[PDB]
Amino acid sequence: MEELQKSIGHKPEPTDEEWELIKTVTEAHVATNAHWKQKRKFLPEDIGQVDLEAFSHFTKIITPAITRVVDFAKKLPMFCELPCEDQIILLKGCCMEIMSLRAAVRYDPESETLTLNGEMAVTRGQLKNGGLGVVSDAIFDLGMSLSSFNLDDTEVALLQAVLLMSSDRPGLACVERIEKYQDSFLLAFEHYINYRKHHVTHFWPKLLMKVTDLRMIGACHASRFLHMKVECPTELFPPLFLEVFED
Ligand SMILES: CC(C)c1cc(Oc2c(Cl)cc(-n3nc(N)c(=O)[nH]c3=O)cc2Cl)n[nH]c1=O
């Protein structure tokens, strides 16, 4: 099947089973990702440049952000086949990974701004000084890189699923079963990329490297959260934002 075709040099497009999964993951992403470019309103220059005034803007939108990731996971059926313990662990893990990817693809190089949530358009300094620190620099840096891949909404969606189904997080019972799901995404992704016919050499390896970069953004963010908990008062943290990134 897969590895013999690879030996021949055929780049196989998706199967009828995979197209059904591709449609599901894409429609899940599209529901949970709201005409972004005109819809944005820019956060002002005096906000930023931890700035608590800047922190306050993000924490309003962060409760929506977190639920958008949970509702995406909800819309995937394989996720629903897992237990609550594993589901909670998986969300707690990939939440900021999925959040960051989405912010990175909404990067405009003329204005030099990621557009958070498809509404709050911010600069590298604003997101940095408002809370994220060096995690701002990484998401911007990613956005700059992801601009020249030109990922469609399917490619972002399948990429998000890969991050969700990550068997290596601690406390997971069904580790074997999560690997099977990730593999079926990863294989379908590889196949969709062949249907797309991108004209960047070694595209698929290069795109897998961005999965690792996203996994770094999440880990660095876990450390930023600890600094945020020290620097900012707990009154300004929403209960869910605490719940998702604590412990
Ligand atoms: C400063 C602190 C409060 C903080 C800010 C922060 O910034 C972001 C926010 Cl509030 C949202 C998203 N985001 N999330 C989604 N679900 C989505 O569809 N689109 C999207 O842009 C992305 C980023 Cl980077 N991330 N984590 C943090 O801990």
Swiss-Prot record:
UniProt effect for mutating A103T: In GRTHD; impairs hormone binding
Major location category of this protein: nucleus
Residues the record lists as binding L-thyroxine: R68, N117, H221
A GO molecular function held by the record: RNA polymerase II cis-regulatory region sequence-specific DNA binding
GO terms of biological process kind: cell differentiation; cellular response to thyroid hormone stimulus; DNA-templated transcription; female courtship behavior; mRNA transcription by RNA polymerase II; negative regulation of female receptivity; negative regulation of transcription by RNA polymerase II; positive regulation of thyroid hormone receptor signaling pathway
Binding site for 3,3',5-triiodo-L-thyronine 1: H221
Keyword Lipoprotein: no
Keywords attached to this entry: Deafness, Disease variant, DNA-binding, Metal-binding, Nucleus, Receptor, Transcription, Transcription regulation, Zinc, Zinc-finger
UniProt keyword Signal present: no
Domain NR LBD: residue ranges: 17-247
Region annotation Interaction with NR2F6: where it falls in the sequence: 41-247
One Gene Ontology term, aspect cellular component: RNA polymerase II transcription regulator complex
Location in the cell: Nucleus
Disease: Thyroid hormone resistance, generalized, autosomal dominant: An autosomal dominant disease characterized by high levels of circulating thyroid hormones (T3-T4), goiter, abnormal mental functions, increased susceptibility to infections, abnormal growth and bone maturation, tachycardia and deafness. Affected individuals may also have attention deficit-hyperactivity disorders (ADHD) and language difficulties. Patients have normal or slightly elevated thyroid stimulating hormone (TSH).
Similarity field: Belongs to the nuclear hormone receptor family. NR1 subfamily.
Oligomeric form and interacting partners: Binds DNA as a dimer; homodimer and heterodimer with RXRA. Interacts with the coactivators NCOA1/SRC1, NCOA2/GRIP1, NCOA7 and MED1/TRAP220 in a ligand-inducible manner. Interacts with the corepressor NCOR1 in absence of ligand. Interacts with C1D. Interacts with NR2F6; the interaction impairs the binding of the THRB homodimer and THRB:RXRB heterodimer to T3 response elements. Interacts with PRMT2 and THRSP. Interacts with TACC1; this interaction is decreased in the presence of thyroid hormone T3.
UniProt comment concerning the protein's domains: Composed of three domains: a modulating N-terminal domain, a DNA-binding domain and a C-terminal ligand-binding domain.
Function: Nuclear hormone receptor that can act as a repressor or activator of transcription. High affinity receptor for thyroid hormones, including triiodothyronine and thyroxine.
Protein name: Thyroid hormone receptor beta
Organism of origin: Homo sapiens (Human)
Taxonomic lineage of the native organism: Eukaryota, Metazoa, Chordata, Craniata, Vertebrata
Full-sequence portion shown in this chain: 202 to 461 of 461
